[PDB]
Design a protein around this ligand. Structure first.
Ligand SMILES: CCCCCCCC/C=C/CCCCCCCC(=O)OC[C@H](O)CO
Ligand SMILES: CCCCCCCC/C=C\CCCCCCCC(=O)OC[C@H](O)CO
Ligand SMILES: CCCCCCCC/C=C\CCCCCCCC(=O)OC[C@H](O)CO
Ligand SMILES: [Rb+]
Ligand SMILES: [Rb+]
Length: 450
């Protein structure tokens, strides 16, 4: 019980701290692209931003979201010591990612035409389509990279994941410098640089997995298990992708809706601050979520339902410390933190007025991240996808648009809808996790990976 929790707290933390740093590096890479570019003109900035929003919505959200299937399959397979199937699951995921990358590439070919038909400036549209075209190799590199990241994570190999992720980040800073400053490749420079970095990420990961002693038992695949693994990859990858797509889409929709409020420059700038602050906090809870998913899937696959419950409890301990830390820290500098993003007194005062709501977002996002990690580790990501629709699009979006436009709350009203949607999401997640039959979920894990 108490020693149960202490041992599981140790293992959850041993995975959460490196994975939190991994997520930091993940989200720092696009920020480095924007910073090294340091774009001078509105035409370039808008076109690149449109390419980023389009490629994230239609492509990158799916690529990252699909490997939640590997969090279920490879995690439970590692728990049952079904080590050969881990590599079969991983390589079935890579092979399945190839046609999806082709579909997304075809869509990205039409980004200029689609944006023009959507009433956007033709120069902006061409710049966006060109940037996205040079982001296409990132898709095929991620077809290897992302499944390999779960290949290492599900086995508890978070240190090589952290090493290669940070090494890729520093490599990306270098190639951004050479492409933007030395080669002077222009607006497409960072996009081309990203394609190089992720392919570099692809080779070092593939090199480690191929040659390390840690991956000797789990590397390789079984031919007669390929088709079945592909089936399961889609079975749990389709909802896992939907969960991420609905989270990223809502982010984009928030910014889009802020452009329709009065004084849209003020409301969009301030909403950009709330979003940046939200993701800045979410990298930590993402590391906790990855640790909870790994330990939940491992213990379920190992036939230990009780320690799986304890894994959720240990992750909730990390959530309470982490969320209380960032909430109180933000509330302390609520009247000051705005000056870290803008020199306008109006923007800083606005962010100061929203900071309590952002603190509530910290608590909820950390809680829902942990419980969504339980979903990915157990196998009911479909509940999480339908919960994302119900919480944010059926409840959060109508209430937020209402308060923003009706009660003249503007961006505060939009974030009020975010807070309410996150509240009902946490409530559903808490009810489904408290009513879970852990012995059956372990039995379902044993059958899922045989
Ligand atoms: C006022 C309205 C309140 C309700 C509104 C919620 C709408 C969104 C919730 C969807 C989750 C549906 C809950 C289904 C619970 C089934 C439990 C279950 O399936 O556990 C098996 C495990 O997932 C192995 O498959
Ligand atoms: C087999 C599965 C293959 C998957 C292949 C991709 C699937 C997702 C693509 C589109 C749906 C996304 C929702 C609609 C996206 C609309 C485009 C958009 O977001 O445009 C933004 C721009 O800012 C406007 O001005
Ligand atoms: C099984 C789950 C099925 C899920 C079914 C749910 C349907 C989602 C509905 C709308 C999302 C729209 C997504 C597209 C949002 C893109 C908007 C955008 O790109 O905004 C411009 C950007 O902010 C630059 O200004
Ligand atoms: Rb979210
Ligand atoms: Rb959000």
């Amino acid at each position: 019980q108490s020693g149960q929790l202490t041992a599981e707290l140790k293992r959850v933390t041993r995975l959460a701290a490196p994975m939190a740093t991994v997520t930091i590096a993940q989200y720092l890479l696009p920020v480095i692209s924007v910073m090294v570019a340091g774009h001078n003109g509105e035409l370039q900035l808008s076109g690149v931003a449109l390419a980023t929003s389009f490629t994230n919505v239609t492509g990158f959200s799916i690529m990252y979201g699909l490997v939640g299937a590997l969090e279920t399959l490879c995690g439970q397979a590692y728990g049952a010591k079904q080590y050969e199937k881990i590599g079969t699951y991983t390589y079935s995921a890579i092979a399945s990612n190839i046609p999806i990358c082709f579909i997304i590439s075809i869509i990205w070919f039409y980004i200029e035409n689609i944006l023009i038909s959507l009433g956007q400036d033709p120069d902006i549209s061409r710049i966006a389509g060109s940037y996205a075209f040079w982001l296409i190799p990132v898709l095929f590199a991620q077809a290897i990279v992302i499944p390999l990241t779960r290949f290492l994570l599900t086995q508890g190999l978070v240190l090589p994941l952290l090493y290669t992720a940070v090494t890729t980040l520093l490599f990306h800073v270098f190639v951004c410098w050479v492409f933007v400053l030395v080669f002077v490749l222009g607006s497409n420079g960072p996009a081309m640089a990203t394609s190089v970095s992720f392919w570099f990420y692809a080779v070092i990961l593939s090199c480690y997995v191929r040659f390390s002693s840690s991956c000797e038992k789990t590397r390789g695949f079984v031919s007669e298990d390929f088709v079945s693994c592909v089936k399961q990859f889609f079975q749990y990858g389709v909802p896992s992708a939907a969960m991420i797509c609905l989270e990223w889409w809502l982010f984009e929709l928030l910014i889009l809706c802020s452009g329709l409020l009065s004084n849209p420059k003020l409301e969009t700038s301030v909403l950009s601050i709330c979003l940046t602050t939200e993701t800045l906090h979410y990298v930590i809870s993402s590391g906790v979520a990855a640790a909870v998913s790994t330990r939940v899937s491992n213990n379920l696959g190992a036939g230990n339902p009780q320690v799986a419950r304890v894994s959720v409890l240990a992750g909730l301990c990390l959530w309470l410390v982490e969320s209380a830390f960032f909430s109180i820290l933000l509330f302390t500098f609520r009247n000051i933190i705005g000056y870290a993003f803008s020199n306008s007194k109006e923007v800083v005062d606005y962010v100061a007025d929203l900071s309590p709501l952002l603190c509530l977002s910290f608590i909820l996002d950390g809680f829902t991240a942990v419980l969504n990690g339980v979903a990915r580790g157990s196998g009911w990501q479909h509940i999480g996808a339908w919960n994302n629709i119900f919480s944010y699009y059926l409840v959060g979006a109508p209430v937020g648009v209402y308060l923003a436009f009706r009660h003249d709350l503007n961006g505060k009203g939009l974030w009020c809808g975010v807070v309410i949607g996150s509240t009902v999401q946490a409530t559903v997640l808490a009810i489904v996790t408290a009513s879970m039959n852990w012995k059956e979920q372990a039995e379902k894990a044993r059958k899922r990976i045989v």
